[PDB]
Every structure is written in C-alpha cells, then in structure tokens.
Design a protein around this ligand. Sequence first.
Ligand SMILES: *[C@@H]1O[C@H](CO)[C@@H](O[C@@H]2O[C@H](CO)[C@@H](O[C@@H]3O[C@H](CO[C@H]4O[C@H](CO[C@H]5O[C@H](CO)[C@@H](O)[C@H](O)[C@@H]5O[C@H]5O[C@H](CO)[C@@H](O)[C@H](O)[C@@H]5O)[C@@H](O)[C@H](O[C@H]5O[C@H](CO)[C@@H](O)[C@H](O)[C@@H]5O)[C@@H]4O)[C@@H](O)[C@H](O[C@H]4O[C@H](CO)[C@@H](O)[C@H](O)[C@@H]4O[C@H]4O[C@H](CO)[C@@H](O)[C@H](O)[C@@H]4O[C@H]4O[C@H](CO)[C@@H](O)[C@H](O)[C@@H]4O)[C@@H]3O)[C@H](O)[C@H]2NC(C)=O)[C@H](O)[C@H]1NC(C)=O
Ligand SMILES: *[C@@H]1O[C@H](CO)[C@@H](O[C@@H]2O[C@H](CO)[C@@H](O[C@@H]3O[C@H](CO[C@H]4O[C@H](CO)[C@@H](O)[C@H](O)[C@@H]4O)[C@@H](O)[C@H](O[C@H]4O[C@H](CO)[C@@H](O)[C@H](O)[C@@H]4O[C@H]4O[C@H](CO)[C@@H](O)[C@H](O)[C@@H]4O)[C@@H]3O)[C@H](O)[C@H]2NC(C)=O)[C@H](O)[C@H]1NC(C)=O
Ligand SMILES: *[C@@H]1O[C@H](CO)[C@@H](O[C@@H]2O[C@H](CO)[C@@H](O[C@@H]3O[C@H](CO)[C@@H](O)[C@H](O)[C@@H]3O)[C@H](O)[C@H]2NC(C)=O)[C@H](O)[C@H]1NC(C)=O
Ligand SMILES: [Cl-]
Lengths: 121, 89, 88, 155, 52, 135
Amino acid sequence: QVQLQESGGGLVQGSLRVSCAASGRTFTTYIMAWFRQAPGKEREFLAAMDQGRIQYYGDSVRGRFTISRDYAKNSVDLQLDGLRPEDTAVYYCAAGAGFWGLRTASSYHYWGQGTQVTVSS
Amino acid sequence: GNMSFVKETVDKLLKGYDIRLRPDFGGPPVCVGMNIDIASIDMVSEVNMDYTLTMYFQQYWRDKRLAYSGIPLNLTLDNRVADQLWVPD
Amino acid sequence: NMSFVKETVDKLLKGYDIRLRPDFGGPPVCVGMNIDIASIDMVSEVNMDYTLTMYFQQYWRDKRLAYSGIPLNLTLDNRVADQLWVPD
Amino acid sequence: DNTTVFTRILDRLLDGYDNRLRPGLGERVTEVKTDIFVTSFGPVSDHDMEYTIDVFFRQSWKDERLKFKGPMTVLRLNNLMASKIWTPDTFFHNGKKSVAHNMTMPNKLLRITEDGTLLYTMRLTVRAECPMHLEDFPMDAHACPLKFGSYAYTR
Amino acid sequence: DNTTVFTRILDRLLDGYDNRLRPGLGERVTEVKTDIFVTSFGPVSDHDMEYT
Amino acid sequence: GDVTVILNNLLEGYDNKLRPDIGVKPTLIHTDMYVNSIGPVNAINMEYTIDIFFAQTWYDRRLKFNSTIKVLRLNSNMVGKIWIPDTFFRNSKKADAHWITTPNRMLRIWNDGRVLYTLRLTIDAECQLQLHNFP
Ligand SMILES: *[C@@H]1O[C@H](CO)[C@@H](O[C@@H]2O[C@H](CO)[C@@H](O[C@@H]3O[C@H](CO[C@H]4O[C@H](CO[C@H]5O[C@H](CO)[C@@H](O)[C@H](O)[C@@H]5O[C@H]5O[C@H](CO)[C@@H](O)[C@H](O)[C@@H]5O)[C@@H](O)[C@H](O[C@H]5O[C@H](CO)[C@@H](O)[C@H](O)[C@@H]5O)[C@@H]4O)[C@@H](O)[C@H](O[C@H]4O[C@H](CO)[C@@H](O)[C@H](O)[C@@H]4O[C@H]4O[C@H](CO)[C@@H](O)[C@H](O)[C@@H]4O[C@H]4O[C@H](CO)[C@@H](O)[C@H](O)[C@@H]4O)[C@@H]3O)[C@H](O)[C@H]2NC(C)=O)[C@H](O)[C@H]1NC(C)=O
Ligand SMILES: *[C@@H]1O[C@H](CO)[C@@H](O[C@@H]2O[C@H](CO)[C@@H](O[C@@H]3O[C@H](CO[C@H]4O[C@H](CO)[C@@H](O)[C@H](O)[C@@H]4O)[C@@H](O)[C@H](O[C@H]4O[C@H](CO)[C@@H](O)[C@H](O)[C@@H]4O[C@H]4O[C@H](CO)[C@@H](O)[C@H](O)[C@@H]4O)[C@@H]3O)[C@H](O)[C@H]2NC(C)=O)[C@H](O)[C@H]1NC(C)=O
Ligand SMILES: *[C@@H]1O[C@H](CO)[C@@H](O[C@@H]2O[C@H](CO)[C@@H](O[C@@H]3O[C@H](CO)[C@@H](O)[C@H](O)[C@@H]3O)[C@H](O)[C@H]2NC(C)=O)[C@H](O)[C@H]1NC(C)=O
Ligand SMILES: [Cl-]
C-alpha cells in the first residue's frame, strides 16, 4: 500500500523546509507536487517537479518557494522563504501522472496526509 | 559589454587563431575535464548486444589564445563558432 | 563558339541576388508544375503511407536570367541551381 | 531597378552584423515569442514509449540591428537569409530523433519587419519520449510531453 | 608567441603544395606501409553473407 | 612542377557549367561497366541489388595539353573541377557511391583531350517480376 509521509515545522514567526517521502512505489517516472489548502479556500497548486527535473510553479508562489526531488530516496522537498500570514494552511504532498493536469488536483492519484503550517506576526 | 565592443573582442580572439594546433602545442599536455548528464537509456538489446544512450556530454579545457579582458560576463556564442575553434578529438 | 556562351552565363550570374525572388516588389511569380510518376512502391497499411518516385519539374520566368544572341536553350550543370533562385 | 534597392537594404543590414552574438547581448534578455501549429499528431509507439508529431514551429523576436526603412514594411526573404543572422538555438528536451525537412528546399521562412521584429518558422517532425504506466492497459491513458527550450542560453 | 613558429612552419609546408599529385610523381613508385588493428571482430550475417 | 603547371593551365578559364561542344555537336559518351556482383533479388519489393564499376569516356578539347607526359592520372579531386556527365539510373529505387576510405572515383586525362571517369556504385534497381510460373 502506497504512503506519502510528510515532515516539517508547524509554526513560524521566516524560512521553512517541508519534505515528503514516498513508500510502496517508486515515483521516478511520476510528477511530484505540492498543494496548499487554507481554511475555507479550495486546494491550490504550489509546485510540481517532473522526471526531467523540470519545475512548475504557481503564480502566487513563483520565486519564493523552491521544489526539489531526491530520486534515490524517492522524496520531494519544498523550501519556503518569505513567509507571510496568508501562507498559513495545510500543505499536501502528491504524486501523479499529470493527466489533464500538472495543476489540477484531480490528476494526482496519490496524496499525503497533509502538514499544518502557520505564520504569526 | 557593448555589442560593438564584444564583436571586436571576439574578432580579435579569432584573428590569427590556428585551429590546426592544440591549445598548448609546444610543451605541457592540455587538461580536459568531462561531465555527462544521462538523459535516457532506451534499448538494451540482447539480439544486437548493444544499448542506446542519450546524454549531454560537456568538455572543459583552457585555451590561453581565447583569453579576454574588459568583459566581466561569460560569452555564450553561437554554436557555429565551434567549427572555428579547436576542440578535442 | 563557347567563349560567347561563357561570357553570357558569367554576365547573367554576376550581380544576381539569390535572396530576392524574380519580382520582389512586383506582382507574384507564376510557377507551373508538372510531374512524371516513375513508380509507386510500398502502399503500407501498417505505416499508413506510400512511397512515390517522380520527376518533379517547375517552370517559371526570371527576367534577370534573360539572354540574347544565343538561339539555344542552355541546359546548365546542376551545380548552378544553388546559385540561382528556385521556389521553396 | 526594383530589386537593387532591396539588395542595397539587405547589404546594409548585413554590413557589420555578427550572427554569433544574440540581440541585446550583455544589456538585456532576448524574449522569444513561440507558437506551434500541429499539422498532424503522429502515431504512438508503445514498444518504444514514444510518439511522432509534425509541427510548424514559429518563433519571433526583436533584433534592433535589422531595422530598416524601405518601400515595404515586411521583407519576406528566402530561408538562406536565416543562416546569415542570429536565430535561437531551440531544441526539444525529450526529443529522440527529429527531422528538419529540406524537400525541395529548407522548409523555413524568415520575415523581417521594418521595426526589427523577426518572424522565423520551421517545419519539423519530432519523435519525442512519452513514458507510460501500463497497469491499466488497454484501459490506460497518458499525457505525452513536448518540451523545448534554449540549449546554450540560460534564463 | 611560442606557437607562431609552428603556424609559420605549417603555412610554409602548405605553400605551393599540390595535393592532386602523389609524392614522388614521375620519379618513383609511392610505397604505402599499411597495417590494421581490429578492435572488435563484428558479428557475421549469414543472411547477407556478410561480416562486420 | 610540370604536372602542376599543366593542371593550372587546363583549369585556367575552364567553365565546368558548360559541357564540351555546347553549340557545335552532341557530346559522345562511351560507356563501360564491370559487374562486381548482382546482389539478392528481393521479390517482395520488386528490386535487385547490383554492384558495378561504371566508366565513362568522352572528349573535351578544353583539356588538351601539349607535353612529354601523355596522360594525367588523378584521384577524385578534379571530378568536381571539370565538367562531368549527369548520368543517372532511371529505374533506381536507391543508389549510392562509395566513400571509404576516400571517394571510389578515378580520372584520367589524355593529351588529345580524352577524359576517362570511373566510379564505384551500388544500385537497388526495380525489376517488375511476373510470378505466374513461380518457382
Ligand atoms: C537535406 O539536408 C541534408 C543534410 O544537410 C543534405 O544532405 C547533405 O547534402 C550535402 C550537399 O549535397 C552533402 O555534401 C556533399 O557530400 C559529398 C559526399 O557525400 C558522401 O559523403 C557524405 C559525407 O561527407 C563526408 O565524406 C565525404 C567522403 O569522403 C567527403 O568528401 C566529405 O567532405 C565529408 O567528409 C567529412 O566527413 C567524414 C565523415 O562523414 C570525415 O571522415 C571527413 O574527415 C570529413 O569531416 C555523406 O553524407 C553522403 O551520404 C548522403 O548523401 C548521399 C547523396 O544524396 C546519399 O546517397 C546518402 O544516403 C546520404 O544521405 C555521401 O556518403 C561531397 O563529395 C560533397 O563535397 C564535394 O562537393 C562540394 C560541392 O558540392 C564541395 O564543396 C566539397 O568541397 C566537395 O568537393 C571537393 O571534394 C570532391 C571529392 O574529392 C572533389 O571531387 C571536388 O573537386 C572538391 O575538391 C576540392 O576540394 C577538396 C576539399 O573541399 C579538396 O580536398 C580537393 O583536393 C579539391 O581541392 C559535399 O560535401 C552531404 O554529404 C549530405 N548529407 C549529410 C548527412 O550532410 C541534403 O542534400 C538536403 N536535401 C536537399 C534537397 O536540400
Ligand atoms: C564530421 O565532423 C566534422 C567536424 O564536426 C564536420 O565538419 C564540419 O562540416 C561542416 C559541413 O561540411 C563544415 O561547414 C562548412 O564550413 C566551410 C568553412 O568555411 C570557412 O572556411 C575558412 C575558415 O575555416 C574560410 O574560408 C572562411 O572562414 C569560411 O567561412 C563553409 O565554407 C561551409 O559553408 C557553406 O555551407 C553552409 C551550410 O549550408 C552555408 O551556410 C554557407 O553559405 C556555405 O555554402 C556553400 O554552399 C552554397 C551552395 O549550397 C554556396 O553558394 C556557398 O558559396 C558555399 O560553397 C560550411 O559552413 C564545417 O566547417 C566542418 N568543421 C570542421 C571541418 O571543423 C563534418 O562535416 C562531419 N562529417 C559528416 C557529418 O559526415
Ligand atoms: C562565468 O562562469 C564561471 C563558471 O561557471 C562563474 O564562476 C562560478 O560561479 C559559480 C556561482 O558563483 C560558482 O558556483 C557556486 O559555488 C558555490 C560554492 O562552491 C556552490 O555552493 C554553488 O552550488 C555553486 O557551485 C562556481 O564555483 C564558479 N566557478 C569557478 C571556477 O570559480 C563566473 O561567476 C561566471 N561569471 C559571470 C559574470 O557570470
Ligand atoms: Cl536472390
């Protein structure tokens, strides 16, 4: 059975690094992505990285968040810099084939449990 | 660097450049570093006893003939200048 | 004589701009085409294609290449097609 | 003559032009506007995990060295003129073995506007990698990429 | 420069050289000492009666 | 060199675009052929492979030279320098010359202006087979 563990901090005043490790399936040939869900708002696409090491970013978080992948360890990491109060949300790791997507959540079949992140001024 | 200045610099570098001679033809060997980025391995065939390999093959060396000054930025030139420049065999 | 033909050909090829079509600013150049089908070889269902061998001949007028005093059709060596303008 | 003025214009444009240097070298970023017209989406080969695609690949960019004043605003020139100027070194990242058609002539067109805007289109047949997950075969679906960019020039 | 002497030597060697004529033309027979190093004896194609 | 000056004089003013006798008479090409091997007959594609040495002899008065040397024997360098007949094989599905180690071509120019031009070729020529009586 496939699992996507996540790890990272919960509260910042700010820089952070949220990591995601996959088990039960090698995602070398899949796109690994990070999504974000704030309270009440719908799930939105933060970043994605492809087998060709090509990186796609959302407009809201272009130039701030940096996605990377460790293919040997089967993991995807997201470095977060320039945090703001509206960045408070649950951050989700996902893996998929990118059918009709690379930006739609429906294209990703495997999802992590989510990690809370909060920014306090 | 200005367009005209870079043009004059490249013309000066390539004027009198003997492509037939290696970068240090007189004495010591020229050192060539190499790096590879493996794009894919495609067809490992037992029938043909071969495999196909796509890669970005990068070679690094020093040619004192091509040294220039006054332009801090690195010069990425059109790939047709490789025919004018010496490269390892 | 061949000297006069050589002078005429050199005069035609001197100052000829291959970059410009026969009437660059003028009306369009009319090109006739005809084909002699030598053979059709491999109508492939699996590949969904056919192989067709042919003699493909184009006909046009370039006033830059007009000459006089030589009542002949000059069949030149095919290397000069690289120097002359042809349709794309 | 009608054509001698255009010959003079082309000679003036190419006078001192260095095609080894990109437009705005060392002073600005060359912005290349691109589009694709897929004339036919070729067959998919599951065995090789690839597909073929025939495209008119159009690029466009500004080159202030090639601005001119002349009888017409746009010079629809022969494809030979493309080799005499700088053009982007675009390549397909996941391409396997592509063909730039040259039957009868190089299937390219170059058009220079008076303001210095260049349009440059090519006819290409690209054989690109399309990795597949065949667990749902024959009820599977794929998203085959086509990725391209500059080979030598960075951001 | 140090390499300028070699550039001049090569230019002198190619000055007046006619590569359409074999060496010793009209004076002797050109002797070519040849040899082969087989790095890999390729497979034999029985269908084509051929070998690489 | 005597041969060098002879060749330079012959090429001086020569125009390879024009055939010999452009306005006088037709150029007569004497053809010779040695079949090294007729390759397999592929009945599916209606073709057979043939390997030949193909030789063409003709006369070019522009290449006349007076000297003690009776014949200039040359490799493939001047094949593109002098005029050559544009001979092509009509029923060829695919043909190609040989280029290993160098182009497999030979040229020989006599003092009377006779040019002999030989080259090695491998041709895949079509052959429409009637297979009613097969085999
Ligand atoms: C669509 O796009 C295609 C790709 O661009 C395009 O195909 C290419 O077209 C061009 C132009 O037609 C072809 O170029 C010609 O090739 C002829 C040889 O063809 C055979 O060899 C080439 C590979 O060429 C190398 O090997 C030959 C043989 O030794 C050499 O002669 C070449 O110089 C060259 O050598 C280099 O590469 C070698 C490794 O490959 C190295 O070992 C070597 O060290 C060199 O680095 C093959 O590609 C050919 O096969 C393909 O084409 C055929 C024919 O269609 C097909 O059947 C086949 O399936 C393949 O597709 C083939 O095997 C050259 O002879 C020719 O050059 C002569 O003429 C030109 C002018 O036309 C001169 O500029 C040039 O200098 C040559 O002339 C000199 O040399 C000859 C020979 O000795 C003399 O007779 C002549 O007088 C002259 O001599 C003088 O100069 C010499 C120096 O230049 C000097 O030494 C002499 O002493 C003297 O002073 C020309 O290069 C090209 O090969 C095609 N293919 C590819 C893949 O690029 C296609 O046409 C386009 N289609 C359309 C419709 O537009
Ligand atoms: C094996 O690998 C080698 C090494 O990679 C590779 O060599 C390179 O081959 C290419 C193709 O033959 C060479 O490109 C040609 O280079 C000559 C050199 O010109 C310069 O020569 C000296 C300086 O060295 C000076 O005289 C001056 O600076 C010259 O510019 C060019 O003359 C050739 O130009 C012609 O072809 C271009 C491409 O089509 C045209 O854009 C250009 O206008 C030229 O056109 C010719 O044909 C026209 C008609 O079609 C005619 O109108 C023109 O007048 C002209 O005759 C060309 O760029 C390159 O230099 C080689 N690099 C080396 C040797 O280091 C082999 O080709 C490869 N073999 C294979 C692949 O089989
Ligand atoms: C022209 O190109 C050279 C070579 O790329 C540039 O020098 C190089 O600059 C990079 C970036 O500063 C150096 O790399 C970085 O180094 C740090 C520390 O080791 C490392 O953590 C980074 O991951 C990265 O590798 C690189 O070492 C350096 N190379 C050398 C030989 O000194 C140069 O700056 C360029 N010039 C211009 C104007 O762009
Ligand atoms: Cl047989």
